[PDB]
Structure formats: C-alpha cells, structure tokens
Design an enzyme around this catalytic site. Structure first.
Site, mmCIF file in Angstrom:
data_model
loop_
_atom_site.group_PDB
_atom_site.id
_atom_site.type_symbol
_atom_site.label_atom_id
_atom_site.label_comp_id
_atom_site.label_asym_id
_atom_site.label_seq_id
_atom_site.Cartn_x
_atom_site.Cartn_y
_atom_site.Cartn_z
ATOM 1 N N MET A 1 9.351 19.345 -27.938
ATOM 2 C CA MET A 1 8.966 20.698 -28.341
ATOM 3 C C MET A 1 9.365 21.009 -29.793
ATOM 4 O O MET A 1 9.116 22.111 -30.264
ATOM 5 C CB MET A 1 9.455 21.759 -27.348
ATOM 6 N N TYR B 1 22.162 29.301 -31.475
ATOM 7 C CA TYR B 1 21.612 29.387 -30.131
ATOM 8 C C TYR B 1 21.327 30.861 -29.770
ATOM 9 O O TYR B 1 20.253 31.190 -29.265
ATOM 10 C CB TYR B 1 22.615 28.715 -29.150
#
Ligand SMILES: NC(=O)c1ccc[n+]([C@@H]2O[C@H](COP(=O)([O-])OP(=O)(O)OC[C@H]3O[C@@H](n4cnc5c(N)ncnc54)[C@H](OP(=O)(O)O)[C@@H]3O)[C@@H](O)[C@H]2O)c1
Ligand SMILES: NC(=O)c1ccc[n+]([C@@H]2O[C@H](COP(=O)([O-])OP(=O)(O)OC[C@H]3O[C@@H](n4cnc5c(N)ncnc54)[C@H](OP(=O)(O)O)[C@@H]3O)[C@@H](O)[C@H]2O)c1
Ligand SMILES: CO[C@]12C[C@@H]3C[C@H](C1)[C@@](CC(=O)N1CC(O)C1)(c1ccc(F)cc1)[C@@H](C3)C2
Ligand SMILES: CO[C@]12C[C@@H]3C[C@H](C1)[C@@](CC(=O)N1CC(O)C1)(c1ccc(F)cc1)[C@@H](C3)C2
Lengths: 280, 262
Positions: free
Chosen positions: B68, B158
C-alpha cells in the site's frame, strides 16, 4: 545592553501578556507576506522583536520587511521559497537562525492554496496539502529544535476549527490540520517526560477576514469572520504565555463548546499506563 | 441490532488481512457467508487466510498481494477485487506501515511513510471503490486508534496519520449526507488489542488489559453493517465513558446551516 540583565517572566507572567515579552526575541513567521502571517510580523515588529519572514513572493516579503523596520523591529529579514521543497524548509531555518544569532519562537502559519470543493478524485490536492500544511511543519520543527532547546523557546502551530471538528468541502485541508494536532500534541507529551523546555501552541481559528478567506467562502459559506489583526495578536500571546492551545472565533458558542475536557482527562488517565524509562 | 445475516452474500474487501485484527475480520466475514478479497504484502500468510476463510463458510475467497506504499497497486487492487466479486458492498481499510514505539527526533522518512500508507492509500482505495459502493449503497470502514482521538507520546507519526483519517473521512461523510451519496463511513477507535504485533511492540512498556482481537474484529464489522459513524472498542470502562465528544457533534450541527451546497 552589556551592563543589563534580568527577566520579563515573573509572577503572573504565565497568565498576563505584555508586549515587552517579545522585545528582542528572535522569531520566524512562515506565510508572512499576507493575511494573518503579515499581521503577526507587524505586531512582533511593534514589540521590538527580531523577525525573519518567509513566503514564495520576494516582492510582497520586501514590503513586509520595510514596514516591519518602520514599526520598530529590532531587525527584519526575508527568505523567499516554497514549502513544497523540504530542502528549502530545512535550509531556511539554519539561514534565519544565522541572521538572528538564534531562535526563540517558530511560527508555522503557511498553507498550500485551497478552495471550497466537494471531494471527488483530487489525490494531488490531498498529497500537496499533507506535504505543505503538515510535513513541512515537521521538517521546520526538526531544523529549529536545537536552537529552541538552547533558548527554551516556543513552537506556534496555526491550525483551524476544521482541525478539531468536521466540515464538508475541506476534506484534504481538514486532514492536514487534524494531522498537526496528532503530531504536535504527541511530541508535546514527549518533551514533557524528556524535560525539553520547548512549548507547543496549537491555534484553533474560526473564519478570519483575510482576502484569501473572504474570496474562498464567497457565495458558498455564510459565517461571521473575525478581524485578522486581533487574530494575529491572540496567536502571539498564546505562544508568549506558552499555552498549549489558543481558540479564536467570532461566535461565543464556539469558544464555549470547542474545548475537549474529556480529552485532557483521558490523557491524564493514560499518563501512568506506559513505562517510558527506556527512551528517556 | 446486528444479525450475522446482514453479511451473507456481501462483497467485502479487507486490507492488512494476512494477520491480527484484519485476519480476524476475514474469518468472521467467512463464517457469515460473505464473498471476501483480502490484501497485505505476504503471499504465504494470505493463502492460509483464504484457505481458513473457505473452511469457515465464505461464499468465495481471494487474495491479491502487494504494498500500500504503491498508490498504483492500491488503485488497481480495488478494480481487480471488484471484478472477482462482481461488485463491492463493504471496504474495510485496516492496514498500517510497520511501526514501533519511539520518541520523535528526526525520522521524517517514518512520518512521510506513515502518512502515505496509513492515510493516503486509504483515500486512493476510497476513490477507486466509490463507484461500486454508490451502486450497492455500500460501506467504508476505517480502522483508527485511540491515538487518532487523543495524544500519546512515542507515536507522533502514527497518531498524525490516524488524526488525518478522522479529518478526511468525517469531512467527506458530511459531503455524502448533503449530496445524498448513500455510502456509510465508520471510523473505528480502538484501544490496545492482543495482536502479536501490538503485544510485541508494547513489551515492557504496556502491561494492562489487552482487548481480544476476535471480539474487536466483530465489533468493527457490526458498526459497518449497522452504518454507525463511529465504533469505540477498549478494555477500560473509563475510556468508553470519556472517548465520545458530544460537544463536537453539537458544534458541527450548529455550523450545518452556514452552507449553500446548490
Ligand atoms: N483566514 C481564515 O479564515 C483562516 C481560518 C482558519 C485557519 N486559518 C489558518 O491561518 C493561516 C494563515 O491563513 P491566511 O488566511 O492568513 O492565509 P493567506 O492570507 O492566504 O496567506 C498564505 C501565506 O502562505 C504563503 N504560501 C502559500 N503557498 C505557499 C507555499 N507553497 N510555500 C510557502 N509559503 C506559501 C503565502 O504567500 P506566497 O503565495 O507568496 O507563498 C502567504 O504568505 C493558515 O495556516 C490557515 O490555515 C485561516
Ligand atoms: N493492535 C492494537 O493494539 C491496535 C490498537 C489500535 C488500533 N489498531 C489498528 O488496527 C489495525 C490492525 O492492526 P493489527 O494490530 O491487527 O496489525 P497487524 O497484526 O500487525 O497487521 C498489519 C497488517 O497490515 C499489513 N501491512 C503492513 N505493511 C503493509 C504495507 N506496506 N502494505 C500493505 N499492507 C501492509 C500486514 O501484512 P504484511 O506485513 O504481510 O504486508 C498485516 O496484514 C491498524 O489500522 C491499527 O492501527 C491496532
Ligand atoms: C485560508 O484559506 C481557507 C480556504 C478555505 C476557506 C477558508 C479559508 C477556510 C477557513 C477555515 O480554516 N475555517 C473556517 C472554519 O471555521 C474553519 C474555511 C472556511 C469555512 C469552512 F467551513 C471551512 C474552512 C479554509 C478553507 C482555509
Ligand atoms: C498495531 O501496531 C501498533 C504499533 C505501536 C504499538 C501498538 C500497536 C499501538 C496500538 C494503538 O494504536 N493504541 C493502543 C492505544 O490505546 C492506542 C500503541 C500502543 C501504545 C500506545 F500508547 C499507543 C499506540 C500502535 C503503535 C499501533
């Protein structure tokens, strides 16, 4: 000057702002050729700060520098370039720091040009918004941190209400503003446990009467705009007072509802759920 | 009130489904008799998943392996998954780039990769999937974290990518509402889950109550099938009590009468 010493920050200085807190301070203002950024450069100049302004246009940046000097800036300089270029962003901070002989405050304000549109397939605008509005802010922070650590300085991050709540027609823009909260609120917690004395101020702004905003909303969005001059000052104040967050909107209902007390409670509850000794 | 029947014969994509929460979702969907297309980079782990999905009762089960990080793969993956199933009812966006707990210093490469994999690929997958989801009045399920709602140290990159998902998907959800696009968007806010990756990454840092991955996987599916805007799944009662932001919903409703749209 050589026979002078002391401090502006004493009793009540974490609660009551004075323009003297910025006197002789070394400040970077990004996206400072127009709008809120230019207004901040002007307020800082009047306070007797040393300023380094940036944007892409050298012509508009020259005008801001000249007016800054007229207003009483200790010194005023510009460095023109695009924040799409991560090399420029990194180099810009080193050069700005060299011009001022250090850095006390980093004001991250620039954004990529954006309009009110429904999201369909413009992944290029999504990527560019992430690169300019968010990633360049991280690069600028990395480049600036050694000087900020030396001065026990401040990072001021210009965000939006669209960086705290959802609005249609600003999906890419809103993602980049939400990303700033996630990134800068995380490093603020790290600085706290690592005893890095660098404050981080996230500024949550509503509609501001800048030419860009007034043109972009025209006939699509009908909201009350707040004055850019007062906005610019409120951002500086929050940074000088080392406030975690600044809220600035024309609606009294917004200021009343925007705060997230449950987020602060939750963060305090998790502060004793993780062992960090290994990194500190 | 959810019924496993809600997923019988449904055409579902599950990303990052070779292990953890993603694999558990593939397994639940298989048991419910759905058609599934799973993805991740690891061929050998996806094959095992496909096999176990078929043993559990899936209407059909396929895998397409790839990264991805590659926006071209992300875009073509949806077209091929849709061709295998003859349509799409639910898009489950779950994959993340490998991440560890660390203080932020100068790893801009991890910041950019996290934004690319955890966020940008989700946008690319959504664009590629939307024509089929419009046709089926389908669902988009976005797997986020508590680190995507509140601040935590050691997860700066993140957390920025998870916050970005909320900003993007909550904005397009408002647009779909006014544009009458009958595609639901479910943002899943998860606490610590007992996946091998998380248990290994929090070792010596977080001990605590780790919620079971199986129930987590089901709660995500349920929220998606029920077309709920948000799903909250954590072991702490205090988290479920404090995670909601009613004032955010009130503010959004107050600004709802400020746009033209026509
Ligand atoms: N005005 C509002 O309604 C509003 C509301 C909420 C939040 N905010 C936030 O406030 C900040 C300032 O907004 P504003 O309305 O004052 O904007 P503005 O008047 O349009 O100014 C944008 C500034 O950024 C510069 N810039 C644009 N593209 C750039 C690039 N690629 N690289 C470097 N600099 C670039 C512009 O100059 P160049 O074109 O010469 O580079 C200009 O100096 C932004 O972060 C915005 O999100 C504004
Ligand atoms: N576990 C927790 O405590 C926790 C807490 C909050 C939120 N979450 C969220 O839950 C979701 C699943 O987490 P998990 O714990 O189940 O993780 P996991 O077991 O480590 O699985 C991650 C999945 O993503 C795939 N993946 C990794 N890199 C990829 C890449 N470059 N391209 C494509 N696929 C890639 C992996 O397969 P390959 O390596 O084979 O590619 C794997 O299938 C994530 O969105 C995570 O943020 C988890
Ligand atoms: C500086 O450029 C702009 C270009 C676009 C119009 C305008 C100025 C703004 C301002 C803004 O951030 N907020 C006011 C809202 O309160 C948040 C906007 C305006 C109305 C909204 F509903 C959402 C977003 C974004 C998007 C940024
Ligand atoms: C799947 O990969 C992981 C790798 C890293 C450890 C672990 C699993 C997680 C899980 C997670 O998102 N949350 C639990 C928190 O409740 C939110 C984490 C762990 C402890 C935290 F403090 C913050 C983040 C992130 C970061 C994602």
């Amino acid at each position: 000057a050589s026979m002078t010493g002391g401090q502006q920050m004493g009793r009540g200085s974490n609660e009551e702002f004075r323009p003297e807190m910025l006197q002789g301070k070394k400040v970077i203002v990004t996206g400072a050729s127009k709008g809120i950024g230019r207004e901040m450069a002007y307020h800082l100049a009047k306070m007797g700060a040393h300023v380094v302004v940036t944007a892409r246009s050298k012509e508009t940046l020259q005008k801001v520098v000249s007016h800054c000097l007229e207003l009483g800036a200790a010194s005023a300089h510009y460095i023109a370039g695009t924040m799409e270029d991560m090399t420029f962003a990194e180099q810009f901070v080193a050069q700005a720091g060299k011009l001022m002989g250090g850095l006390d405050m980093l004001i991250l304000n620039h954004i990529t040009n954006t309009s009110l549109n429904l999201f369909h397939d413009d992944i290029h605008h999504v990527r560019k918004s992430m690169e300019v509005n968010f990633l360049s802010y991280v690069v600028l922070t990395v480049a600036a941190l050694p000087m900020l650590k030396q001065s026990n300085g401040s990072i001021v991050v210009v965000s939006s209400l669209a960086g705290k709540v959802a609005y249609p027609m600003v999906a890419a823009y809103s993602a980049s503003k939400f990303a700033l909260d996630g990134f800068f609120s995380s490093i603020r917690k790290e600085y706290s446990v690592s005893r890095v004395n660098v404050s981080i101020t996230l500024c949550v702004l509503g509609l501001i009467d800048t030419e860009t905003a007034m043109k972009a909303v025209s006939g699509i969005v009908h909201m009350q705009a707040a004055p850019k001059e007062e906005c610019a000052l409120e951002i500086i104040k929050g940074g000088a007072l080392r406030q975690e967050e600044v809220y600035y909107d024309s609606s009294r209902w917004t200021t009343l509802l925007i705060r997230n007390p449950c987020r602060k409670i939750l963060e305090e509850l998790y502060s004793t759920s993780y062992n960090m000794d290994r990194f500190i």
